[PDB]
Design a protein around this motif. Sequence first.
Motif, PDB file in Angstrom:
ATOM      1  N   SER A  24     -16.525   6.879   5.917  1.00 17.08           N
ATOM      2  CA  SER A  24     -15.355   6.848   5.051  1.00 17.08           C
ATOM      3  C   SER A  24     -14.988   8.231   4.527  1.00 17.08           C
ATOM      4  O   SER A  24     -13.861   8.424   4.058  1.00 17.08           O
ATOM      5  CB  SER A  24     -15.595   5.888   3.887  1.00 17.08           C
ATOM      6  N   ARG A  79     -11.259   0.476  11.235  1.00 15.01           N
ATOM      7  CA  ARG A  79     -11.817  -0.541  10.360  1.00 15.01           C
ATOM      8  C   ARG A  79     -11.365  -1.927  10.808  1.00 15.01           C
ATOM      9  O   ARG A  79     -10.336  -2.087  11.468  1.00 15.01           O
ATOM     10  CB  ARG A  79     -11.393  -0.295   8.909  1.00 15.01           C
ATOM     11  N   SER A 116     -11.778   2.616   2.867  1.00 15.89           N
ATOM     12  CA  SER A 116     -11.202   2.954   4.172  1.00 15.89           C
ATOM     13  C   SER A 116     -10.064   2.002   4.542  1.00 15.89           C
ATOM     14  O   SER A 116      -9.971   1.514   5.671  1.00 15.89           O
ATOM     15  CB  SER A 116     -12.278   2.974   5.258  1.00 15.89           C
ATOM     16  N   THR A 117      -9.181   1.748   3.578  1.00 14.17           N
ATOM     17  CA  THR A 117      -8.044   0.863   3.784  1.00 14.17           C
ATOM     18  C   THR A 117      -6.798   1.502   3.186  1.00 14.17           C
ATOM     19  O   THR A 117      -6.856   2.557   2.549  1.00 14.17           O
ATOM     20  CB  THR A 117      -8.285  -0.520   3.170  1.00 14.17           C
TER      21      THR A 117
END
Lengths: 198, 198, 198, 441, 441
Positions: free
Chosen positions: E308, E338, E401-402
């Motif tokens: 990340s 992801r 990580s979005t």
Amino acid sequence: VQLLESGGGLVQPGGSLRLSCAASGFTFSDYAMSWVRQAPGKGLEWVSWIYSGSGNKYYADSVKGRFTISRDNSKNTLYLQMNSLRAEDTAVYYCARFPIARTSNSQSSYDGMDVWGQGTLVTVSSASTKGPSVFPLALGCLVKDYFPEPVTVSWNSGALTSGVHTFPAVLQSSGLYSLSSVVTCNVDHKPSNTKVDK
Amino acid sequence: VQLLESGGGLVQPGGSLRLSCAASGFTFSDYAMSWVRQAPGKGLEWVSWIYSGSGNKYYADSVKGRFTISRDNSKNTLYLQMNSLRAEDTAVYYCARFPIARTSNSQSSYDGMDVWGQGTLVTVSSASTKGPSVFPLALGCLVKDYFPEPVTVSWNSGALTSGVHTFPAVLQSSGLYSLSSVVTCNVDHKPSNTKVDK
Amino acid sequence: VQLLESGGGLVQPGGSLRLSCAASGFTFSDYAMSWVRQAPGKGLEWVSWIYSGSGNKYYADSVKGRFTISRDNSKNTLYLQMNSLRAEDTAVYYCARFPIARTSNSQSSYDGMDVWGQGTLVTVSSASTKGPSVFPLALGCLVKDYFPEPVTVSWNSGALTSGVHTFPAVLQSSGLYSLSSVVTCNVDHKPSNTKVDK
Amino acid sequence: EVQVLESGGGLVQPGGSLRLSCAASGFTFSSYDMSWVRQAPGKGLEWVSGISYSGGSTYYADSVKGRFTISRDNSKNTLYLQMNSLRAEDTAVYYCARDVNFVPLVTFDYWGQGTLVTVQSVLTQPPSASGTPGQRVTLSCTGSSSNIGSNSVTWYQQLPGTAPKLLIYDDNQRPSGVPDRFSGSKSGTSASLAISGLRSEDEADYYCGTWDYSLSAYVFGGGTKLTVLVLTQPPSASGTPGQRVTISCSGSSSNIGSNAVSWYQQLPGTAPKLLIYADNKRPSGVPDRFSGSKSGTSASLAISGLRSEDEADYYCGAWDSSLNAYVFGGGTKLTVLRTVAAPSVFIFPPSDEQLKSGTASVVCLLNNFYPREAKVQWKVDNALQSGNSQESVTEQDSKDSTYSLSSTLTLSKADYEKHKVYACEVTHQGLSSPVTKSFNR
Amino acid sequence: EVQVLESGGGLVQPGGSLRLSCAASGFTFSSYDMSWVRQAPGKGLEWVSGISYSGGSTYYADSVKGRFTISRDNSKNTLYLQMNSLRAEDTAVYYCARDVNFVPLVTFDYWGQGTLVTVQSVLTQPPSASGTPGQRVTLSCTGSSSNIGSNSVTWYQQLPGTAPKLLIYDDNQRPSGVPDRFSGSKSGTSASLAISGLRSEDEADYYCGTWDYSLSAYVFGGGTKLTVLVLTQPPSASGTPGQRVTISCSGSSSNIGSNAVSWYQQLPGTAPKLLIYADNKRPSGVPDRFSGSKSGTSASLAISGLRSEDEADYYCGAWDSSLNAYVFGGGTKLTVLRTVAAPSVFIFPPSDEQLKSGTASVVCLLNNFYPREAKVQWKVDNALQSGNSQESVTEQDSKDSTYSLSSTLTLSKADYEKHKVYACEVTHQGLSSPVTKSFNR
């Protein structure tokens, strides 16, 4: 070096029993010992670890309290009392020698689980046993309705070896396992102690 | 090692001003210096490079003539006079130390732009400033109608840190930027020098 | 090191002739020698192998009896008498030096076919020869109705070299080959011994 | 060796006297300035006094000014501190520190072991600073224009119960033996040390020391006790035979970063074999292609030149310092990329002992097929089975490196004769045209 | 050591005399033939003379016949050349070469350093030959039946400004120290050397030397000076965590081929961090996984084991020798693959201070969603917005990580009450069924 486990068999849920691991071929007192659990068709789940009886015994987070590991260096044996057994513990237990003493020039699996025994199989289930039923079929032979796993299945009592494929047993609606050997068939069920030649 | 830039702010088109880069933590006279431009939301444009005042000063093809770089090793500062500023030069200027002296065993970013300062922000625009307007909304808070970028927006003056997502401001029809902080809100606008707690 | 073959040409079926391989650049007596056959547009078919005249001569299973290999270390030549030639033997014969003597530090293609000569071409056919006929087409020129393969085709007698693509000849209904050179054309047919400049 | 032994410390009484003597060997003792530094039990370093190379100039801390005499005999290369009219505050451990450089840029590199004598700080260094492993911690000294601004700032790392050790000198540099991790910094009248990344060996007291041209003493800093506060593995990696496959698992600092990882190869139906025991090392009896390498928190098992014997479950296992468990990896299922084979399809009507038993288990088999993905649909006269058929595929063949699947449909005794024809259709890449043997009742 | 020192060279005048003396040590000087060889400044080697093992037989080049006397004193193991009645053509550098073998198969292995004396070739070796790296160049000597055909051909490689070095002797062999790359060849009265593959160290003058049984001299060859002949970067590379991503940028010879490339990692909202400073080397403080490798004009930054923290813009920068600018790379936007997340959808009616301000900015938000591709359509009671709504997505989350996206619709104050319901429909892979909160006025 060989570690032989004994005590794997039928266990009633919440029952109590004792795995005994006879270790030969090495100075038993110098190496730590451990038990490792493997659910049928699943990964290695560490059970417990010991070096000295008077020292600290380490246990998995899921088995803290219900398991007890111990040594007997006089008998070169490693004992595991498992009591109040729960359902997920039906598995294969391996007795593994965990070297913790590295010497100067002799470099040996220091801190690595070095040698693993053949491992016994523990079934935590209230279901009773049932003798295997062999049915002859590339020549094949089904073995159905045997409890519990494992059963040793072979062609011509091991004489015919090439091409003998054995697939893992299945969990049926009746809870009764079944395999088949494909290329007489020898089916030997230790828990029910029946040897069948079909 | 730290390089601190000063002089970034409101600039009228065709104006003149002076970026001062105070460099500390290294022997200033032992490393070339450079200015690097970064348009908001764009790549890095090599502005200029210098090693000695009597030495040739390298300039970008688009800034030849209108920019002047200089050093002051007594003050450990790097100066950039930018005059007759054009519209595309609104950007963030980084003062970067470009090592040009490699020693035998000490291997150090020879010829690499080694350390970059925090960078100031220069707005070449005739538009006047306007104080931010904060409007409370996952709890959020919009900050609209502030000029120019940047504005420092935070939740509970930095006490509440996890989950605070800040999206880049936008260029609206009125030319006035707007962000929002989502999870009191502290909005600090340096160019207009207003601290707002909503 | 160079091996030059001679004796490749027109052969009547069931005929007899002699390939002579002059070997220079190495001590001919120390290395074994061999003949290797390559049918046009096909793989390498080993013909025969020798090391000493008084020793054992080895021959391919398809050529046992009708071929005879021999050496002449005084002349540094390798001779191959082929008699009662059959149709499938129309091919290119390579004279290959097969080192069998490895020395201590000198490591040299021991037991590997080390160096191969340019190879001659043997046509076992009762059909007579015919001079090539040029047919100019990216400029090009078609050499049709020449027997047998090969023919040396080039542009401007080798002066113009880049872009000259030559495709392999074909076996037509009349049994007469044809190529074309594409980018004056020089067509040299050795078996009919005609040099044509078109 | 530039060792400096020291002795003369013991039980004394207040108002008495005590001669401390330290002998230096391995260097020209008569050319380097030296000093006596003091550490109260559980308190920061306090610089007692200091004597020059010639012994001509002597400097004393104002807390001990006028009652301690520093002396130096170069013939025997020894150096003495004569403590007279002692107080209760002087009970501490004493070191004599070699001064690398002249004053004011004092630099204490080599220190004595410590003599236990029983009988405020100018630099306002923070009492403590808490860090985490892998963090970037800046512990900042603070002084006046006479302490920090004009003279070099030197940083000492004192491990618990040992002599201090020089880390940073001249505000920027490091000795030969200090990792570059530590970085000095100085701005105006404020110095600092930056530790980028922390380990278990950075647990120590960090002191900032600077000379004074006004106070004429080498003031130290106060304390700043720096405190440091599942093997995720791919489920199924693969590669063609002859390739080099990298199985990379990662846990945590407690899982794998600070403990020796191991790699085991469990072939189907057999106990695991340890292929890697150290982070890198390999036990004897294992092919040399099975390489291992642990970088930081990620351990890589590299298998070069795959073969039919290389397909197995590769586990990575490491002891946990926190959870106290030998946590294994998820288990990477390595398989070799074989050319797609042709599924040999067979089917068997249930035997008459099935009828005598009361069930009917009809079996369909797909032998010698690649890859693992394949489907079997029981087309019983253009009718599909509804969740009754069960199938399990074999592991990749030990020699042929291919798969075998068997689907068993277990239907009722009366269900076998109520229908006439049973068949199994196969969906695989190796056979675009479905192959099926339609047996009849 | 078989070194042969030599001296006696200096400024002299035409018609004078000069004694050159070279002393040989490390071998039996009285058993090996030796010779004097001459190289005019910027001209090929010219073999002056040669004396046998016993000193009995002496050979001289016809250009210097009758005026140079070669002599050899074995007691002191030294060897002299007495130059008498000198000419202007004799200004050159002199070497004395050890002869490995008897005449005629002369073989000059060890050569003197060179004495600078200030005061046609039989073998028609080509004046020069041009080669390319990795090529197979055949530079061919040429002589008569007395030069090449009957006696061994020896090839010497003289680097610029050094003594010659033996490469090929006896027409085929190589000394202990010459790579097999060089291969001798000889056919009839024409010899040759074949260099298969060339490097920067093959830039030298190659001479062919052969004895003559008729001319009675060791003729050399002539010369044959062998001569060897914007950072375009991907816009957005990506890979799953734990993978090894290769970011390969390419410029020109001036951009990157002849200058040191560097790789920088700019995380969103932060200044770039140099990850690679040389073509390969990596600064301390950077994880070892960030490898760099510049092959020719293409520089590759390899990031192994993504996480990340690894998602950032990776720029490659190199100085330009022609444009004179640190030309950088387009900027590779690295993102981690992801698992597709579920967009949490929210909406906010504009506050009443919007009404007091004269506008209405209604906001719709999609939080914690992957990947970057997502659309928001403002369905205002089954009506779509016409180019008035503006939206910007966040960067990939530092830990989760979005992505997070916000669409703002900025409509007029009177436009808010002329309609009753406003809603936002979302199009994303994580939510096949659209999710929307329909707020009312």
